[PDB]
Amino acid sequence: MAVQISKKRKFVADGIFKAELNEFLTRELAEDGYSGVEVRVTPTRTEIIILATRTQNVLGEKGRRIRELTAVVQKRFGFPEGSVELYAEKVATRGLCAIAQAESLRYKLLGGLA
Amino acid sequence: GHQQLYWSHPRKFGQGSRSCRVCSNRHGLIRKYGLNMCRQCFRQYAKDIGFIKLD
Amino acid sequence: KSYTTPKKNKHKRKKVKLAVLKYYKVDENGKISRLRRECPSDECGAGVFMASHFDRHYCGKCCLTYCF
Amino acid sequence: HRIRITLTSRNVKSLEKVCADLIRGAKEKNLKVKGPVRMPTKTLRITTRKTPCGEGSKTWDRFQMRIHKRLIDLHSPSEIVKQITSISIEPGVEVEVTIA
Amino acid sequence: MLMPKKNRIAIYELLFKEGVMVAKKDVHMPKHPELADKNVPNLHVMKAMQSLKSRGYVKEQFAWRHFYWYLTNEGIQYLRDYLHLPPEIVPATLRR
RNA sequence: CGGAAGGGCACCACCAGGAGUGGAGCCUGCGGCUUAAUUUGACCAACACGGGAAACCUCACCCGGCCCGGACACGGACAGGAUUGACAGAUUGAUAGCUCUUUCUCGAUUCCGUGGGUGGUGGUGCAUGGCCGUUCUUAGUUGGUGGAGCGAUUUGUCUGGUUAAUUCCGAUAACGAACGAGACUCUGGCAUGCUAACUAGUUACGCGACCCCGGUCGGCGUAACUUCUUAGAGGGACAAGUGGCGUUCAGCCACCCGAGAUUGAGCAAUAACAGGUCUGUGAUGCCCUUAGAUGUCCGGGGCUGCACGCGCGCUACACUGACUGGCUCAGCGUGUGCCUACCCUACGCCGGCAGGCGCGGGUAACCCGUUGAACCCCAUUCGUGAUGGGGAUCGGGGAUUGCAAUUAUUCCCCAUGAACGAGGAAUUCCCAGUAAGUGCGGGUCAUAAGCUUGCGUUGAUUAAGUCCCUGCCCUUUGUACACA
Ligand SMILES: [Mg+2]
Ligand SMILES: [Mg+2]
Ligand SMILES: [Mg+2]
Ligand SMILES: [Mg+2]
Ligand SMILES: [Mg+2]
Ligand SMILES: [Mg+2]
Ligand SMILES: [Mg+2]
Ligand SMILES: [Mg+2]
Ligand SMILES: [Mg+2]
Ligand SMILES: [Mg+2]
Ligand SMILES: [Mg+2]
Ligand SMILES: [Mg+2]
Ligand SMILES: [Mg+2]
Ligand SMILES: [Mg+2]
Ligand SMILES: [Zn+2]
Ligand SMILES: [Zn+2]
């Protein structure tokens, strides 16, 4: 690499990247029961896995919202066009995932029930 | 020329140069290892980054 | 909070009625004569005229001053 | 010819699995390979106050991140190197390839 | 905001060719990084897309220093009418 | 809960000690004074704390000046202009057309009033969340079944022994359990057994240099290996064995063999506080300002101001010392940044000096660097003198960084040469590679540690106990308290 950044700060930068992506999707997909993100980093290919519950809801109609999310990620982080691909997965037995149930409990709390 | 001196003061160093990438705060920051984040944010995102209190 | 010096009122830039008509001169025939000068600069080459002050001409687009 | 592949990882178990898989692949192809060396671990240590404000007893945290780097030397054509490296890779390990 | 007509057209055309556009929450930016062919300062970008959100055309999200704007169909038709475009053309977020 | 009683624990308590503090100067923080502000929170569990070592920014306070960065909706104002900018000349602090005369411009974005917003390190931590601190890192807590009681509840959760531990044994209307502790993870120890290594080495081999066959080389290359180095799977210690105390149970002492016969840290909980953070935030309710701004930007001041008191620290009060030369040994780490404009340094010249000038190495077990650190060790000078201890105050000069040092950023030289003769009342921390002495990394950084977080070197006396003091926990008792 021309920049040839050192590994000590390369790992830290990657971790900050994961935290920033995690919080961004937490704000975006709160209604969708978002639970976490797995990033599969490879040379020339970057597959990012979004673990949620309502995968159809988070995919949207004809994948419009996942498309614009891919464009958002590419523009914000400066990745080459087409290098990143977002995939949506459904977590089996989502009751055991605290984050998803916490989001559901938060939405139930704001709903108005006791 | 308002734009000639609206932000003409040099921001090449000092606390007002570097700011938290999450809070836009200029206090309790860490520039070591290129964190560029406040201590509160670092504690909040330590697990996400990879820092774990092994010892 | 109370003040002692009166506030500095904003500059009210006055309007001019048909200011375009003051650049040329009216003739009955199909000919054109230009009264004031025109800026020979690059960006404003042959369309933007210059100011006509009491002692010098000026163009604000490129900050060109022609003193006498 | 004298290819050298560098693997940096945060998890010891994953990195050892990856290096073991690569050397086993070299053994299957019957290629002369140097033993897996271990660079000294890099421990990025950060100490911060627990309290967001300044009150309370002075209590400090110890957040450390461990990075392990292992490199392997092999004697094979670059096409063989690309074939071996393109498969059986854990996502958490960063891979570097050097010809010299 | 005294946004020049050229900058407004540039913002609209980029928003119409790419359905989303990001911008850091930083007024003290010389020019926008995503589009640098023309000046179009980041302040103008922020205020223009703030206006689009205000009149119910675009949707805003925030991640620690940046805004993300998502253009709905009602904003698509408004942008098409403003730029004098046919209904056939669609932004990159619609077609495959 | 007690201003009652009995047990238990704790070097944030004591015994014996060690090093200190409080005694002097200085750095820093708090109160007070003063001031346009010398803003603010905190006042065991505030006081070198807000990672708060502030010339600019940070800054929230004050002295003055710009911008709207007042979206959107509604009614006017007109392509026979809505209205932005503008060097001259005055004014200012700045070439802010911010303002006053004078006109050229920009091209429906605007502007004028009204709803509606919007911003705020503004108030409210006595509304909050989260985090953190404290009780308390002591050891406490809760079901199931089963006995007692009409019931709320109680026994289990205990008379004693033992343990760092409600940790266990053991009597027992209790038996089985769960959280905690423990366990666990990381860390240091040692393995000539395993895996490996030209980004680490070792042993030999061959040259090169030097001294009287041999000796040295971090001088150069190569035949084996991982003992030394780095890092992976395992092993290894368990009160295992012996002699004693102890119902012969738990457990404790001494010892042989043994790398160890108590390495340190992390997480640490049914609960409570009206402890702190609204100044960490695009986490936030309400209130307030919102254009003559509590929003933002610019110039300057202040956060350091000094009759005084207090706290955390540095330097020392000297002969086990100071000064001058010689010799000699480490590990923790970091090092060219998204915006970001700022890296760590070998080498050769100039110069006493900080420092300046040139080509090189390093995104790193690769270069600084075998990190030639100090203490300490060796040899002279000083001779009990506030003395060559001491470096406060202060003058002159020389450099670095920064847009900018004045209230002297920091560094260097000459010189001036204060108190302090081991410190009262009172009081702090500690028990093994411990304290203490000493130096070195990271945080803050354009410039920078007299703080803190870690590391390395030398490295001890006391002591294997207690409730005397101080706290704090359990039990008994009392209650007219139960927002206790
Ligand atoms: Mg700050
Ligand atoms: Mg104790
Ligand atoms: Mg003070
Ligand atoms: Mg005071
Ligand atoms: Mg500032
Ligand atoms: Mg402030
Ligand atoms: Mg503004
Ligand atoms: Mg109203
Ligand atoms: Mg918000
Ligand atoms: Mg402002
Ligand atoms: Mg003296
Ligand atoms: Mg002086
Ligand atoms: Mg005391
Ligand atoms: Mg009574
Ligand atoms: Zn932050
Ligand atoms: Zn002109």
Task: Walk me through this protein's architecture.
- The structure is cut from a larger assembly and holds chains A (114 residues), B (55 residues), C (68 residues), D (100 residues) and E (96 residues).
- Chain A is built from four helices and three strands.
- With 114 residues, chain A is of the alpha+beta class.
- Chain B is an alpha+beta fold and 55 residues long.
- Chain B has helices spanning 2-5, 39-44, 46-49, and strands at residues 29-30, 37-38.
- A two-stranded antiparallel ribbon of chain B has the order 1-2.
- In chain B, a hairpin with a 6-residue loop joins strand 1 and strand 2 (37-38).
- The longest helix of chain B is centred in the C-terminal third of the chain and has 6 residues, at 39-44.
- Chain B is elongated, with a radius of gyration of 15 Å.
- The relative contact order of chain B is 0.14.
- Chain D has 100 residues and is α+β, with helices and mostly antiparallel strands.
- Chain D has two helices and five strands, in the order βαβββαβ.
- In chain E, 39% of the residues lie in helices and 17% in strands.
- Chain E contains three helices and three strands; from the N terminus they run αβαββα.
- Chain E has helices at 5-17, 42-54, 73-83, and strands at residues 20-24, 58-62, 66-71.
- A three-stranded antiparallel β-sheet of chain E has the order 1-3-2.
- Chains in contact: A-B, A-D, A-E, B-D, B-E.
- The interface between A and E is medium-sized, with 13 and 16 residues.
- The complex binds magnesium ion (MG) (14 copies) and zinc ion (2 copies).
- Residues 15-16 of chain B line the site of one magnesium ion.
- Chain B binds one RNA strand of 484 nucleotides through residues 1-34, 36, 38-41, 43-44, 53-55.
